[PDB]
Each structure stands twice: as C-alpha cells, then as structure tokens.
Amino acid sequence: FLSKLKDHMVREEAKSLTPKQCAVVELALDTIKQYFHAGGVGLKKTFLEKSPDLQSLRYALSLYTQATDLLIKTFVQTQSAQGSGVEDP
Amino acid sequence: ELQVCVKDYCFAREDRTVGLAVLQLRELAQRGSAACWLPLGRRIHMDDTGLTVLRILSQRSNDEVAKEFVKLKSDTRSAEEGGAAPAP
Amino acid sequence: RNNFPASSPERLQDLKSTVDLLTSITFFRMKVQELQSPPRASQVVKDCVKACLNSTYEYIFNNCHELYGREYQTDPAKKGEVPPEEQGPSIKNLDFWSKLITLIVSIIEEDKNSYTPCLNQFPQELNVGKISAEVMWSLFAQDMKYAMEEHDKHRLCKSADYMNLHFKVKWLYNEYVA
Known part of the structure; x- marks a missing residue:
C-alpha cells in the first residue's frame, strides 16, 4: 500500500480498509x-488492553x-x- | 504550517517547481513575528505517519481538500536546471 | 481533435469504435492475459484528452492571432500572421485577450458538443466539455494575471478598455468557470 497509493505505481483508488473491513x-x-x-487462563484483559501492540x-x-x-491536523501535529x-537545499 | 514554493513562470510549457520550504506556525505562536531565511528543498521530508496519512488522504480521491492537500504535499521540484532528490 | 476532427462524423465514429476497441483491448488484458490492474480505459483516454487539450492551449496561446484571425476576426486584414507580440500577449492593446476569450469559448463548445457525445463510453468519468473548460481556464488565468500586471506598468490602453475587458472576463468566468 506504499506502492498502490502512497507511491506512483498504480492509478487505483487502492481501496482503503473500508468501514466493514475496519469492523471485522x-x-x-x-x-x-x-x-x-x-477466560482468565491466558493473559489478563488489562495487559491485552494496555498492550502497546494492540494500541x-x-x-x-x-x-x-x-x-x-x-x-x-494529524499530519501537521506529527510531521x-x-x-x-x-x-x- | 506555511509551505513556500519557488516556481519558474512558463507560458506554453508548465511552471516548473524550483523548490519548497515548510515553516511551522507553532514557532510563530511564540515568536509573534519572525524574519527567517527558509532553505528550499526538492520534496518535503516525512515520517511513517505523514506517509500513512498521505496514502490514506490519496484514497479520498474525490475530496477537494484532500486532493489539494495530497497534490500540495506531493508537489516536488520538477528536478531540472539544478537537481532531483533532496535529503530529509 | 487533429486525428478525428469533429467535422468528420465518420472519424468521430472511427474514434468511438476506437475507444470501443480500446475497451476491447483493456478487457483482453484483464480477461485473457488475466492482468489484475491493466491501465483503466477511462484514465488512459483522460490523459490523451488532457494531452490534446494542452496541445490545443499551447497552440492557441502562441498562435492566438492566426487562430482568432482565421476563425472569427472582425477585420479580414487581421486573419494572418500578426506579430508574435499579438499572437501571444500585447502591451499596446487588450484585443489579444478578447480574442483568446473567444478561442477558449469555441473549443469548450466543440468538446462539450461534438466530443463529449462521441466519447460517451465513460460518461460518469469523461465529460469532455468540463475537462476542456477546466484545463483551458487554468492555463488562461495564469497568463491573463501576468498580462494585467504587465499592462499596469505601461498603461497604454485606457482605463475604460480594462473596464470593458473586466466585464468580458467577469462574464467568461461567471459563465464557464464558476
């Protein structure tokens, strides 16, 4: 997805993660x-929710x-x- | 942020981008007024999130603000008369 | 425009059948070669149209007098190769610009009227009349702005002439562009 709409490679709309594929x-x-x-036998919900990987x-x-x-705005604040x-120069 | 672009005026042809500079208005939020010599680049330098936001905005290929934003960030120096690719 | 002139309906039909062939090739690439993102027939053509329009604009902005000359000019002695400073912009007069306005109108009409119907295969994507109006105005407005700035340094035309030009330009924008 660098290639298919960050970059120059294809004049396709890339298709975003659509609301339905964001859901899912x-x-x-x-x-x-x-x-x-x-059900508590594995990792605490708290570890999983705070997981930076998940976040x-x-x-x-x-x-x-x-x-x-x-x-x-995100671009200006982040860049x-x-x-x-x-x-x- | 201001984006300052120098272009060569070219009737019949196309107005070539000579270069581009970014000024962050966060600085001016302290400074109030600034004299500055902005160095000009060939393209604007970006992180993963700029490039992610840009590839996201480019999919909004009917939003006129996104179109002009994407077009504006995707402006780079039409290389010639003094060179193609910058440093970040 | 040059290869399939509107004045030949036959070449407009060969043009139509050509885009039908180009859809047929895009479809062959997609279906028989099984290519996944072959060049989209509407974008392929939109490039060609933008190309043909820009070649038109360059040619009109450089040859305004020869073109406006032969195509409309209100004096037959002014149809020929009038000086390049009058086939492109004059500092002496606004007439090149009144002439350029009429050229622009005429082309957008031919595109709206002959080519938009000839090239209906992507009607949603390919209004030839609109692509014409945008391309041509953009290229114009740049050139006009610099012209008005140049006149301002010299003031050879009367105040009135620029006011008349303003009403023509006001009209033109408020017609095609706005």
Missing part, C-alpha cells in the same frame, strides 16, 4: 484478545476512517520535523 478486524482483534485472555494496531486502524481535516532544516 476490530472484531477479529476482540476475539483474538478473548482467545489470549482464555499501535488500533491507531493505524483509526487512521483509515478519520476525517480529512483530522488527518490533515514536526518539517520545520528544522532542509537537507540539500
């Missing part, structure tokens, strides 16, 4: 979490549905390094 995944993840929890996964997912302005010296 968020539910697959709650099931995996329940599986790894195994990172949720973050990437949250981006795929976010509004244009919010994506753009902080676009203001500390161009290299090869």
Whole structure:
C-alpha cells in the first residue's frame, strides 16, 4: 500500500480498509484478545488492553476512517520535523 | 504550517517547481513575528505517519481538500536546471 | 481533435469504435492475459484528452492571432500572421485577450458538443466539455494575471478598455468557470 497509493505505481483508488473491513478486524482483534485472555487462563484483559501492540494496531486502524481535516491536523501535529532544516537545499 | 514554493513562470510549457520550504506556525505562536531565511528543498521530508496519512488522504480521491492537500504535499521540484532528490 | 476532427462524423465514429476497441483491448488484458490492474480505459483516454487539450492551449496561446484571425476576426486584414507580440500577449492593446476569450469559448463548445457525445463510453468519468473548460481556464488565468500586471506598468490602453475587458472576463468566468 506504499506502492498502490502512497507511491506512483498504480492509478487505483487502492481501496482503503473500508468501514466493514475496519469492523471485522476490530472484531477479529476482540476475539483474538478473548482467545489470549482464555477466560482468565491466558493473559489478563488489562495487559491485552494496555498492550502497546494492540494500541499501535488500533491507531493505524483509526487512521483509515478519520476525517480529512483530522488527518490533515494529524499530519501537521506529527510531521514536526518539517520545520528544522532542509537537507540539500 | 506555511509551505513556500519557488516556481519558474512558463507560458506554453508548465511552471516548473524550483523548490519548497515548510515553516511551522507553532514557532510563530511564540515568536509573534519572525524574519527567517527558509532553505528550499526538492520534496518535503516525512515520517511513517505523514506517509500513512498521505496514502490514506490519496484514497479520498474525490475530496477537494484532500486532493489539494495530497497534490500540495506531493508537489516536488520538477528536478531540472539544478537537481532531483533532496535529503530529509 | 487533429486525428478525428469533429467535422468528420465518420472519424468521430472511427474514434468511438476506437475507444470501443480500446475497451476491447483493456478487457483482453484483464480477461485473457488475466492482468489484475491493466491501465483503466477511462484514465488512459483522460490523459490523451488532457494531452490534446494542452496541445490545443499551447497552440492557441502562441498562435492566438492566426487562430482568432482565421476563425472569427472582425477585420479580414487581421486573419494572418500578426506579430508574435499579438499572437501571444500585447502591451499596446487588450484585443489579444478578447480574442483568446473567444478561442477558449469555441473549443469548450466543440468538446462539450461534438466530443463529449462521441466519447460517451465513460460518461460518469469523461465529460469532455468540463475537462476542456477546466484545463483551458487554468492555463488562461495564469497568463491573463501576468498580462494585467504587465499592462499596469505601461498603461497604454485606457482605463475604460480594462473596464470593458473586466466585464468580458467577469462574464467568461461567471459563465464557464464558476
């Protein structure tokens, strides 16, 4: 997905993670979490919810549905390094 | 953020991007007014999240704000008369 | 435009059958070669149209007098190769720009009227009249802005002439572009 709409390679719309595929995944993840929890026989719900691995996964997912302005605000707030010296001017 | 772009004016042809600079208005939120010499780049330098947001915004290929944002970030120096790819 | 002139319905039909052939090739690549993302027939053509429109614009902006000349000009002595400073922009007069306005109108009409129907295969994607109006105005507006700035340094035309030009431009934008 670098190739198919970050990059130049294909004039396709890439197809985002669609609301339905955002769901499905968020539910697959709650099931995996329940599986790894195994009704308390596995990992605590608390470890799983605080899991940075899960939080990172949720973050990437949250981006795929976010509004244009919010994506753009996110870009300006995150791209902080676009203001500390161009290299090869 | 301001994005400052130098272009060569070219009737019949196309107005070539000479270079691009970004100024973060967070700085100006302290400074109030700033004199600055912005160095110009060939393309804007990005992280995974800029590139993720950009590949996300490019899928919104009917949103005019997204189109112009994507187009604007995806502007790079039309390489020639002084060179193609920068450093970050 | 040059290969399948609107004045030949036959070449408009060969043009239509050509895009039907190009859909047939895209379909062969997709179906027989089993290619997954072959070049989409509407985008392939949209590039060609943008190409043909930009070649049109370059040619009109460089040859405004020869074109406006032969195609409409309100004096037959002014149909020929008038100086390049009058086939592109003049500092002496606004007439190149009134002439360029009419060229732009005429082309957008031919695209709206002959080609948008000839090339209906992607109607949702390929309004030839709109792609024409956008491409041509964009290229124009740049050129016009610099012209008005240039006139402003010299003031050879009267205030009035720029006011007349303003009403024409106001009209043009408020017609095609707005």
